[PDB]
Each structure stands twice: as structure tokens, then as C-alpha cells.
Amino acid sequence: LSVDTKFKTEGLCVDIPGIPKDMTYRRLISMMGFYPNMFITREEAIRHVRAWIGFDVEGPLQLGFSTGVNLVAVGLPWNVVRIKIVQMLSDTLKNLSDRVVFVLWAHGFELTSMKYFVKIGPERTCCLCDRRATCFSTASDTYACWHHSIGFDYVYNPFMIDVQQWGFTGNLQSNHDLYCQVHGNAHVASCDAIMTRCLAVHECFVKRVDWTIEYPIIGDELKINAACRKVQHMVVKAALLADKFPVLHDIGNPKAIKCVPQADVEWKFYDAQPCSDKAYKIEELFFTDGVCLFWNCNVDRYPANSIVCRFDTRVLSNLNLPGCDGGSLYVNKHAFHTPAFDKSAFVNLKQLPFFYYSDSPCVPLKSATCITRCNLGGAVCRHHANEYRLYLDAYNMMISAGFSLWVYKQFDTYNLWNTF
């Protein structure tokens, strides 16, 4: 974002009466009392969604953050408030991003408060590792990343974006409430901060959707994705073996592949991209023959003859970010906004029980859920013991990452034993 780009100042003129209508970012930064630009484009913001922290200041000043924290600066003086800000941001962001992006609905006080807890300069590295520096300490004159900032007092080279520059009519609440009923306005700064981030997420990940953007690996992305593939193949293979459906309706990703390539079923594909806003209405999408597979195809009510994987947006993890209207922004390689988990969608189904099935050739493993020829015969062999434990690990990884599994009520693993 060029510092010579124009900044629309109308939103700031109640806190800053007389502000010039003609204003560049260069001038704004100077007026703020201060790494080419502190402010960033929407495109840069979207790439760094994991770093978004909503931030509002209301006038003694109340500072609100999308973390829910409200701090009062006078109430405590800025030299202690800034220490809290560093700690809060470090703990929130250390496992998410290499920076912070303050998401604003700027009316003035937030921008003029930055001088009191922000320092800027050349891009730097941490004193104790190779990560970029996000904090500065006036005590030791050293720099740190989010992981090594304990006892640091200033945020260093933060980034920020004013949502009000995107072309809105009306105030924050009126624009936020058009899309979301989950964040109230309790007239605390943190409430505005949360609404501001929520509006931003909606505009960039619900209204618009860019699946070309890739996001760095920050956790168990790869293990989770491999487990999801392993579980999908297991559950679908077993379902076809147990109930011998003549046809399978695979509803979802237009680029989906047969997950059980050696199955005898008639495999029919139906295209549906991830629904970012509201769950798909089954009436519109639609199938009573055979079985329907909804692998991360979120519908309002699944048919009774279904196999389902549905992401639970309430799960707490470094991959799952708070979203809009109860939804969550799941960032795993790509960013997927996901409508809120709704248990009523599974009323026609039941939870899929854990099991391990294998027809491959054959501490000792004892388990009622190791469905193998050797267990049928009384003693699980080493190979299938090894594979059972690896599958169980993958199964638990995918559950812990927030995915939930559902199946037609007639599904019975007892029917798999006679495949041997």
C-alpha cells in the first residue's frame, strides 16, 4: 500500500474535528506521531488473516480487542497498559502468525493511541531466534518475536487496516448486523473490536472467496489431512461392504475422486463448492437409492441414507479462527469459512462409531473394534495390530481437529465380520 494513497477522513472527524479531507497515509502516519507502510492492502490483510486483531478505543480511554479484553488507560497509566498489550498479543498470536494486523473501524482515538504502545523502524529479527521481531523492550533495548517477548513493553512494526476505507454506508453496528446475529453491542470497546473483525471476515471470506491463496503450515495440517483421507476411505469402504448399496451419490467438491476406487458400486458425482455463508438447503441440492456421501458438504438436513463428515465450528485450535454469525474460518492450506455447526442437521442419522476394518493379508492387541480375520479367529496379528493403532491415532487426530462423523442409522459393524 503506497503511503501516497489517499485516506478517507470523514470517519475520523468527530474525534478529530477539522481533519483535512485531503489526506495520504504518509500524512496520517505523521499525525499519529510516527516496513514501507503501517497500513496494508486488503490483499495483504487476507494473506495474514491469522494475524487479525480487532481493535477499538472509546473515549480516560477504554481499549477493546477482539480477544474480549478491555483495558482502561488513564484505569492504569500507559506504561503498564502497554505491558499488558504485549503479553496479550504474544499469547494470542504466537502459534498463529509472525505479525499482528490491527483491524479498525477508525473514528480517531484508536489511531492516536498507537504512539503510546507502538514503536516502528526497520524490519528486525528476534534476539533469541530467527523469527521476525514483533515487540521491543525499552529496558534492554532488544527485540523479540511473539514467543520470546516476556517482559517486553512495546509492540513493534504492527500492521493495520481501516475497514471504513472499503466503502460502507452507515455505522459499524448497522453493517455488521446485516450479516451476523451472534455479536451483540454491549457498549464496550471489545464489542466494537469483535464486530469490526467479524465484518472484515465476512467481506473477505464469506461475500468473497479466494481459494488460490495459500497459508503457511503452523500445526498438524498435514497429519490432519492424511487422517481425513484415511478415515474417508475406511468408512466408505466399510459402508459399501456392509450394506451393499448399488449406487453412491458423492455430493461436494467438483474435483472429488472416488475414495474407494475398487468398490463395485455405481459412483455418481454431484458438484457443490464449499458453502461459505449458509448451509446448503437439501431441497435445492437434490438420491433415495443407495447411499449419499457428504464429505464436508454442509447441508441444513442430511437425508437418512447418508454418510457425513461435518466440521464442528466450535472446536478450539490454532487452525480454526472465530468467524461470522457463528461460523468459523478454518485455515488449513486454504481458508474455508464454515457455517455454524448445527446438531439438528443430523436428526436423521447417528454418530459413526469408531472401528477398524481390514481385509488385507495377515503388547498384543485386544479389541472388539479391530474387525479383521485374525481377530475373528481369536488373536490379532502384529500387522493388523500395528495398523489398528495407526488408524486409531489418525481417527483421534481428525476428531480433535474438529471433524464429526455421522451415518445412516442401520449401519452395523457386526455385518462386516461375514466379509471374512
Ligand X SMILES: O=C(NCc1nc(C2CC2)cs1)c1cc[nH]n1
Known catalytic residue at 56:
yes
Q: How many CB atoms lie within 10 A of CB 345?
A: 20
By the rule CB under 5 A, 200 interacts with Zn ion: no
Interacting positions 160-199 with Zn ion (CB under 5 A): 180, 183, 198
Annotated catalytic residue, options 58, 153, 162, 387: 58
User: Taking the CB of residue 224, how many other CB atoms lie within 10 A of it?
Assistant: 20
Contact (Cβ atoms closer than 8 angstroms) between residue 317 and residue 219: yes
Question: How many residues belong to the site for ligand X (CB under 6 A)?
Answer: 11
Convert 291-357 into a string of H (helix), E (strand) and C (coil): EEEEECCCECCCCCCEEEEEECCCCCCCCEEECCCCCEEEEECEEEEECCCCHHHHCCEEECCCCEE
Active-site choice (48, 107, 110, 387) = 110
For the question of residue 177 being annotated catalytic, the response is no
CA distance 248 to 246: 7
Exposed, middle or buried: residue 293 (CB in 10 Å: 0-12, 13-18, 19+)?
Answer: buried
Query: Any contact of residue 198 with ligand X (CB under 6 A)?
Result: no
Dihedral over Cα of 412, 413, 419, 420: its sign: negative
CA distance 17 to 20: 9
Task: Choose, from 107, 153, 162, 192, the residue flagged as catalytic.
Answer: 192
- 387 interacts with ligand X by CB under 6 A: no
Selected catalytic residue, list 48, 56, 153, 162: 56
If DSSP codes are grouped into helix, strand and coil, which group holds residue 197? Answer: helix
Cβ 365 to Zn ion, closest distance in Å?
A: 10
58 is catalytic: yes
62 touches ligand X (CB under 6 A): yes
The response to whether 129 counts as a known ligand-binding position is: yes
The residue range among 57-65, 130-138, 349-357, 388-396 that interacts with ligand X, by the rule CB under 6 A, is 57-65
Annotated binding-site residue? 348: no
- Cα 23 to Cα 277: distance, rounded to the nearest angstrom: 36
Residue 192's binding partner among Zn ion, ligand X, none (Cβ under 5 to 8 angstroms by kind) is ligand X
Classify residue 62 by its DSSP letter: E
Residue 200: CB minimum distance to ligand X, A? 17
Binding flag, residue 129, Zn ion (CB under 5 A) = yes
Q: Does 188 bind ligand X (CB under 6 A)?
A: yes
Q: Which residues bind ligand X (CB under 6 A)?
A: 58-60, 62, 72, 75, 187-189, 191-192
* Residues designated catalytic: 56, 58, 110, 187, 192
Which residues are known binding-site members for Mg(2+)?
A: 56, 58, 110, 187, 192
